[PDB]
Amino acid sequence: HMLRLSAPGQLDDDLCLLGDVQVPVFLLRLGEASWALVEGGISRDAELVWADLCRWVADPSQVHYWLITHKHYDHCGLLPYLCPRLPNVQVLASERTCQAWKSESAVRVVERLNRQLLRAEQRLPEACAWDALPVRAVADGEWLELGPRHRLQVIEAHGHSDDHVVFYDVRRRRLFCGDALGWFDEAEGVWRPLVFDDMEAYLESLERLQRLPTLLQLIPGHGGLLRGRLAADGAESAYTECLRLCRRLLWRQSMGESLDELSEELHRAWGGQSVHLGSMRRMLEILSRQA
Ligand SMILES: [Fe+3]
Ligand SMILES: [Fe+3]
């Protein structure tokens, strides 16, 4: 499809997709000898992403920044395994996100969730400690002056998770929106809501994101790059789909349906491309809590 770039490699003059489109890691050419990464992947992809990186970047000492949208296992799983190979990298994440990496209970869930994704033959690279990562904490509204042509603004976007942020390149009308709009469904071309924390904050984040200057490029945490109207209308559409799901929880519960009976229907309907179910229930619980 032409409103959506989902192939590994070059997406724009300054931007490549590395690794798997479902859990991509984006690469920004900041300058002749200066690069940046955006989104932190899953752990098992450490060697794939590495191999993909080294095809665009001769010296990895040139990777200076790694931007992280939130703490979930599928958006920072690469950090302990590839940061040691990127000696000059500096990891930029929100205050709450950095605290997750200091929590031992939280780190243990990240590691366990990622380990369920390792293939039979494979083991992982040698790794940093999670509290040893070269990290600089960023705050809502901060400007990340990454290079002469790359200037991104950090925007708090809680709701998907209580730590979530997005990164706006206003020069390029390019939003790295993480999971804040949900999961884009390539089969039907609509967003699927990902509310795993607070529904009001999720809707409020989308309200603010809609007020951004018209997007040209919308880059979620999964699925690749969205352009044209998919980007322009992204935040409004995601907001709409979320409401749509609320009204359907309401409806089906007014007809005596358990959360599970709809947890199954939603898992059956969308879980064949985000492959969870236990996550699927905490969302339906969260939404039915606040309405
Ligand atoms: Fe997430
Ligand atoms: Fe995710």
Residue numbers in the entry: 0 to 274, 282 to 297
Show the paper's wording:
PqsE has two biochemical activities, a protein–protein interaction with RhlR, which increases RhlR transcriptional activity at target promoters, and an esterase activity. Curiously, RhlR function additionally depends on the metallo-β-hydrolase enzyme PqsE, encoded as the final gene in the pqsABCDE biosynthetic operon. With respect to RhlR, PqsE is required to form a protein–protein interaction that enhances the affinity of RhlR for target promoters. The effects of the PqsE E182W and PqsE NI substitutions on pyocyanin production are not through impairment of PqsE catalytic function, as the catalytically inactive variant, PqsE(D73A), remains fully capable of interacting with RhlR and driving pyocyanin production. These results indicate that PqsE has two independent functions, catalysis and interaction with RhlR, and it is interaction with RhlR, not catalysis, that is required for virulence.
To test whether repositioning of the PqsE E280 residue underpinned the inhibitor mimetic characteristics of the PqsE(E182W) protein, we engineered the E280A substitution into PqsE(E182W) to make PqsE(E182W/E280A). We determined the crystal structure of PqsE(E182W/E280A) revealing further changes in the PqsE active site. In this case, the presence of an alanine at residue 280 eliminated interaction with the iron atoms, and the loop consisting of residues D275-L281 was disordered. The remainder of the loop was ordered and its structure reverted to a conformation that was more native-like than in PqsE(E182W). Consequently, the removal of the glutamate–Fe interaction via the E280A substitution apparently unblocked the active site of PqsE, partially restoring WT activity. Indeed, whereas PqsE(E182W) exhibits reduced binding affinity for the active site fluorescent probe, BB562, PqsE(E182W/E280A) displays WT binding affinity for the probe. The catalytic function of the PqsE(E182W/E280A) variant was greatly improved by the “unblocking” of the active site (34% compared to WT PqsE). Consistent with the repositioning of E280 into the PqsE active site contributing to the increased stability of the PqsE(E182W) protein relative to WT PqsE, introduction of the E280A substitution reduced the Tm of the PqsE(E182W/E280A) protein to nearly that of WT PqsE. Nonetheless, the PqsE(E182W/E280A) variant remains incapable of enhancing RhlR transcription factor activity in an Escherichia coli reporter assay and it does not drive pyocyanin production in P. aeruginosa PA14 (respectively). Analysis of the PqsE(E182W/E280A) structure, and the surprisingly modest conformational changes that are apparent compared to the structures of WT PqsE and PqsE(E182W), suggest that the structural integrity of the G270-L281 loop is essential for PqsE to interact with RhlR.
